[PDB]
Design a protein around this ligand. Structure first.
Ligand code: NI
Ligand code: NI
Ligand code: NI
Ligand code: NI
Ligand code: NI
Ligand code: NI
Ligand code: NI
Ligand code: NI
Ligand code: NI
Length: 175
């Protein structure tokens, strides 16, 4: 259904900060140039209306992951990011988790089913990095190592608890 037409036009709309574009979905669109995927990331940096960005199954690679990481350090709007079924490696994934040190607005990240498998050292490091982020509530990924898997689940439950705590101590103290 969507195609290179929509891809160029939607990108313009992002750059223009169109208030009516709250969701960008590129899922399953083939033959998007890597630099076009990068441009999406670059445009989204200062976009104030896009809440969800989904690029699943676009052949996005680490260059795309790096571009997205940069954008994540700046963007205060996107709450849900879908990277499933792409060519992102553990490097691209670490860059994103390092970016999340600087991001308190993204609550859902999913990278299921990458064609290049993450690696244990990367899973161990994701868990270490996630400790420093208190706003991510959902991580779409299935861990190979039982240890990082447990730690990440506990961290996500923690973050869920931290968000209720913040809201409650706002409501309580605002009387
Ligand atoms: Ni879809
Ligand atoms: Ni493929
Ligand atoms: Ni590349
Ligand atoms: Ni390169
Ligand atoms: Ni690949
Ligand atoms: Ni997975
Ligand atoms: Ni999975
Ligand atoms: Ni292939
Ligand atoms: Ni499971």
């Amino acid at each position: 259904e969507p195609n290179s037409t929509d891809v160029e036009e939607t990108l313009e709309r992002i750059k223009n900060n169109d208030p009516k574009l709250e969701e960008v979905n590129l899922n399953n669109i083939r033959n998007i140039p890597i630099p076009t995927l990068k441009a999406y990331a670059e445009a989204l940096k200062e976009n104030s209306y896009v809440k969800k960005f989904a690029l699943a199954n676009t052949r996005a690679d680490d260059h795309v992951a790096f571009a997205i990481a940069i954008m994540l350090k700046a963007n205060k709007t996107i709450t849900s990011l879908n990277l499933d079924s792409n060519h992102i490696t553990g490097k691209g994934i670490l860059a994103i988790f390092r970016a999340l040190l600087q991001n308190n607005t993204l609550t859902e990240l999913r990278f299921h089913n990458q064609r290049h498998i993450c690696g244990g050292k990367t899973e161990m490091e994701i868990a270490k990095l996630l400790k420093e982020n208190t706003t991510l509530l959902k991580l779409g990924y299935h861990f190979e190592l039982a240890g990082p898997r447990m730690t990440v689940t506990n961290l996500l439950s923690r973050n869920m608890d931290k968000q209720r705590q913040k809201r409650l101590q706002e409501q309580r103290q605002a009387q």
